[PDB]
Amino acid sequence: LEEEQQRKHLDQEVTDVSQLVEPVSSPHQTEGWFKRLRYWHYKETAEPT
Amino acid sequence: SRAVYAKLWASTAQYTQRRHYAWYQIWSRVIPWSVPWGIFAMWMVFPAMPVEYRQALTFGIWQKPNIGTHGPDP
Ligand SMILES: CCCCCCCCCCCCCCCCCC(=O)OC[C@H](COP(=O)([O-])OCC(O)COP(=O)([O-])OC[C@@H](COC(=O)CCCCCCCCCCCCCCCCC)OC(=O)CCCCCCCCCCCCCCCCC)OC(=O)CCCCCCCCCCCCCCCCC
Ligand SMILES: CCCCCCCCCCCCCCCCCC(=O)OC[C@H](COP(=O)([O-])OCC(O)COP(=O)([O-])OC[C@@H](COC(=O)CCCCCCCCCCCCCCCCC)OC(=O)CCCCCCCCCCCCCCCCC)OC(=O)CCCCCCCCCCCCCCCCC
Numbered sequence: 001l002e003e004e005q006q007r008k009h010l011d012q013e014v015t016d017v018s019q020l021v022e023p024v025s026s027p028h029q030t031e032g033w034f035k036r037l038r039y040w041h042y043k044e045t046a047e048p049t
Numbered sequence: 050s051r052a053v054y055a056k057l058w059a060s061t062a063q064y065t066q067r068r069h070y071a072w073y074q075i076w077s078r079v080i081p082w083s084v085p086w087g088i089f090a091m092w093m094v095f096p097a098m099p100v101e102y103r104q105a106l107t108f109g110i111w112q113k114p115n116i117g118t119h120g121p122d123p
């Protein structure tokens with residue numbers, strides 16, 4: 001149902017790079033010495049009991 | 050019951066310890082192979098050592114072979 005009731009950003013016109021929608025997720029996530037890449041999603045560290 | 054499910058969940062909490070135990074077992078089975086190969090290492094490298102060290106390491110049993118050449122000069 002939602003696919004035929006929502007609006008979509010790609011159905012609408014923009015002309016300049018400054019008008020592109022802004023990401024929802026924050027830039028400020030990963031930290032530490034000599035870490036170039038500052039953004040990740042998934043990890044496989046194990047769960048507790 | 051919560052209690053029983055908790056016990057069943059917790060049964061495997063100590064995975065890493067069991068894996069260390071496995072390390073111990075397999076290394077105990079494996080490590081005696083060092084004796085054959087150690088003897089052969091020493092076998093090959095014995096004639097490279099100084100004559101004195103050959104005499105010492107064999108508690109004086111080993112001595113220069115006697116082939117009837119290079120005897121003393123009066
Ligand atoms: C007998 C004589 C004896 C003499 C004794 C003299 C001793 C002098 C010792 C000097 C020591 C200086 C360093 C002090 C560190 C203090 C750390 C601290 O307090 O931590 C607290 C605290 C620790 O908590 P934490 O939880 O770790 O938080 C920090 C984060 O983890 C951090 O992560 P983050 O995510 O928050 O940040 C982003 C992250 C990640 O950032 C990035 O990845 C960005 C990278 C961008 C790179 C872009 C490069 C582009 C250009 C390339 C050009 C081409 C070059 C190659 C080609 C060239 C040709 C060859 O940034 C970094 O990783 C920063 C790295 C900085 C490296 C600085 C290295 C300094 C070396 C000094 C020399 C030491 C000796 C050398 C060896 C000697 C021989 C063994 O850290 C902080 O609060 C941050 C402090 C950061 C300080 C950095 C700046 C230090 C400036 C020091 C100036 C010293 C001047 C010396 C002059 C000497 C004159 C004689
Ligand atoms: C009898 C009845 C008949 C029975 C028949 C039963 C059937 C079996 C047969 C038995 C009968 C006898 C048969 C004879 C067999 C022996 C002869 C023999 O085998 O000679 C071979 C013979 C080798 O001659 P050789 O090499 O000139 O011999 C020179 C000697 O080895 C001289 O060399 P060396 O002196 O330089 O040797 C060095 C040696 C020197 O050895 C000694 O001097 C040892 C002395 C031994 C003493 C004996 C003790 C036992 C007796 C004690 C008595 C107990 C008394 C109680 C009982 C009675 C009273 C109750 O030292 C070592 O090896 C190293 C030392 C030990 C290493 C381990 C580390 C221990 C460290 C010690 C720690 C403690 C602390 C020390 C630190 C000091 C500070 C505290 O063969 C040849 O000459 C070569 C033949 C050519 C064939 C080439 C092979 C084929 C190659 C082609 C391959 C290319 C094709 C491609 C591959 C093809 C693949 C298929």
Ligand SMILES: CCCCCCCCCCCCCCCCCC(=O)OC[C@H](COP(=O)([O-])OCC[N+](C)(C)C)OC(=O)CCCCCCCCCCCCCCCCC
Pocket residue numbers: 090093094096097098099100
């Ligand atoms: C994993 C091991 C792989 C081993 C591969 C090695 C194969 C090649 C071995 C070459 C040895 C050469 C030794 C250099 C010294 C000169 C030798 C020489 O001729 O000297 C004169 C001597 C005789 O001396 P001389 O009479 O000419 O006068 C000099 C007198 N001395 C020696 C006292 C200074 O000749 C020999 O005795 C021949 C040398 C025998 C040594 C053989 C060594 C074999 C090495 C294998 C051991 C491997 C153990 C495992 C190690 C692994 C560790 C991770």
